[PDB]
Amino acid sequence: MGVVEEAHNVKVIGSGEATIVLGHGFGTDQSVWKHLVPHLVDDYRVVLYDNMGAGTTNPDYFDFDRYSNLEGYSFDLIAILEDLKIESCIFVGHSVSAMIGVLASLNRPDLFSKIVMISASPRYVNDVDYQGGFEQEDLNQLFEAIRSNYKAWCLGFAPLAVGGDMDSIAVQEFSRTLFNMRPDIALSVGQTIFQSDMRQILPFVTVPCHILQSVKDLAVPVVVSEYLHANLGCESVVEVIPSDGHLPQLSSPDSVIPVILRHIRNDI
């Protein structure tokens, strides 16, 4: 394939035009979708890709200036869609990829028929009129642990993000992909994500959004899903899943995959 697609480990499964594009969150890669993809390929052409800076990507390609804001990732997404000649897709975005897809849709609404968000937030930091789940001091605390001992940080962070028991296979897999990131890139990307603020742009969104999350997610209070629904300019729906974890499609597929599929396959 072309350099852009190779650099993002792009996979295209199937032919035709009905197309779904799946974007992953911080610390993981396209493998996060391993329990969803089997249920899509009979009906849709499926496109997987990795975000620049994931451990599966070449660190020489990580441009710190380009990726200092989420727009860099949104332009990567649009580039891939253009290179593949995709004229319309359903975009499924996990965590930060939800907002990356939203930003892409503001520049190129024509490329997206709908967005399905899994574990999305427009803002992680609290203020006097907004609950995001983190005080700035909590985030200050986390930037420090990455610098001193990256391995320790990964082993402590993975259980909190994934939930469930700490020696579950899912926690181990995430700790592995998380540790595969170069520490300086993990820190830079972490800062960019946790300090982002997409709240102000939500009213400009026009592509319909399906807002899905676990009822227990350390990074996404349930009120965030309500905030998204109330402030997005587009038609939207919310479904909070009786699941635990920030990567619930990976760690609780039996309860989570059916929900995601219903929102992919059915329109508002």
Swiss-Prot record:
Induction of its expression: By red light.
Entry's localization field: Nucleus; Cytoplasm, Cytosol
Keyword Cytoplasm: yes
Superkingdom of the source species: Eukaryota
Tissue: In young seedlings, expressed in hypocotyls and roots. In adult plants, expressed in rosette leaves, stigma, sepals and silique peduncles and tips.
Effect of G133E: In kai2-1; loss of function
Predominant location: nucleus
Keywords per UniProt: Cytoplasm, Hydrolase, Nucleus
GO biological process, one term: photomorphogenesis
Active site: S95 (nucleophile), D217, H246
Family listed: Belongs to the AB hydrolase superfamily.
Role noted for this protein: Involved in seed germination and seedling development. Essential for plant responses to karrikins, a class of butenolide compounds, structurally similar to strigolactones, released from burning vegetation that stimulate seed germination and enhance seedling photomorphogenesis. KAI2 is not required for strigolactone-mediated responses, but MAX2 is necessary for responses to karrikins and strigolactones. Lacks detectable hydrolase activity against karrikin. Karrikin binding induces a conformational change.
Protein name: Probable esterase KAI2
Organism of this sequence: Arabidopsis thaliana
